[PDB]
Design a protein around this motif. Structure first.
Motif: not given
Lengths: 86, 114, 86, 114
Positions: A6-7, A9, A39-40, B33-36, B51-53, B98-102
């Motif tokens: 998720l991180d 970028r 999916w990712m 937008n994406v979390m897991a 995970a969800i978007r 988790k979230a992107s960049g968190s």
């Protein structure tokens, strides 16, 4: 290291090929099923690219091969020296 | 990594029981937008289990939790949830969102006896 | 770290843009005059590239800009996945 | 890094004196196309002071050694040389040679008094 997929970028000056490699290696290291990894990829690969590469990839439209995506983005970022160094 | 997370809802339950985990995001009015949800049992790597978007609300699950757990997000509260039904002893682990960049939260322990 | 510029050689799968960046950063770190650094660029940059990139750069001939060199070599190495991953 | 190097020829000299450093390469009948001499004084980074390329025999020097030092290579002996004339106290340092892909040698000390 461990890093969550998720991180990942793309950097503002990072070549898209370097970002694809980092994305792949991070996703390969994730402990997850192939279904979750797919999916990712579908959800994050283009979405987490930098603005210049997202513009190019949006213009290509859906269904491009990764080779077509990397060729289209080749001029973005990377070394800043463009003139005759030699 | 600016957005902060914090899990709650874990505990000790008997096999066949249920829990609902919550993950509160702070530092923004919004969530990525994406979390897991990750599961981490002692001596094992953290496992990406759900995970969800946002936007289309598409979700994905690890095979080990299909038909039992459900991931949802409430963007009006900045909370990510994991409904955990029909719990099994093998679900015993620390759960982290988790979230992107968190940043990472402290997690919440789920212990299932039998 | 410290690394001698004499030792910077492009990997067999390393994108030429990654090699140019590593060459530049290593040469920038060298404690040497600009004259010595220019001789090192003229002597080592193309010579220490990988065989595929040397073939392409030889075919371009002398006097190319670094942008022309990097564009010409873009398809060599990098991520091995070329098909539709998405 | 397979080719091994070993320097000799250093020592103590008076200002205005001369030394000839030698660098013997082992592990191959050949030496890389580019070779160099580095100067390393205590508390400073190693400084690339002279280099040579085979084929055309082109050389380059740091401004601090122009007109005094000369780099040459003998591919019939696998030795790189540094002729050091008109030595100055500021030339006091450890001197090391290098070839592309080689290991580093132990260096040779040059000490110039006055």
């Amino acid at each position: 290291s461990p890093t969550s997929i998720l991180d990942i970028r793309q950097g503002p000056k990072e070549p898209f090929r370097d970002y694809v490699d980092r994305f792949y290696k991070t996703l390969r290291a994730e402990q997850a099923s192939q279904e979750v990894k797919n999916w990712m990829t579908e959800t994050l690969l283009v979405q987490n690219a930098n603005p210049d590469c997202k513009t190019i990839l949006k213009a290509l439209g859906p269904g491009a091969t990764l080779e077509e995506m990397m060729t289209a983005c080749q001029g973005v970022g990377g070394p800043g020296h463009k003139a005759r160094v030699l | 990594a600016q957005v902060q997370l914090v899990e709650s809802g874990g505990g000790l339950v008997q096999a066949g029981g249920s829990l609902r985990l919550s993950c509160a995001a702070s530092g923004s009015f919004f969530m990525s937008n994406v979390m897991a949800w990750y599961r981490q049992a002692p001596g094992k790597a953290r496992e990406l289990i759900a995970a969800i978007r946002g936007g289309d609300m598409s979700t994905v699950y690890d095979d080990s939790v299909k038909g039992r757990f459900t991931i949802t997000r409430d963007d009006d509260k900045n909370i990510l949830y994991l409904q955990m039904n029909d719990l099994k002893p093998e679900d015993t682990a620390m759960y982290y969102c988790k979230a992107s960049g968190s940043s990472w939260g402290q997690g919440t322990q789920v212990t299932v006896s039998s």
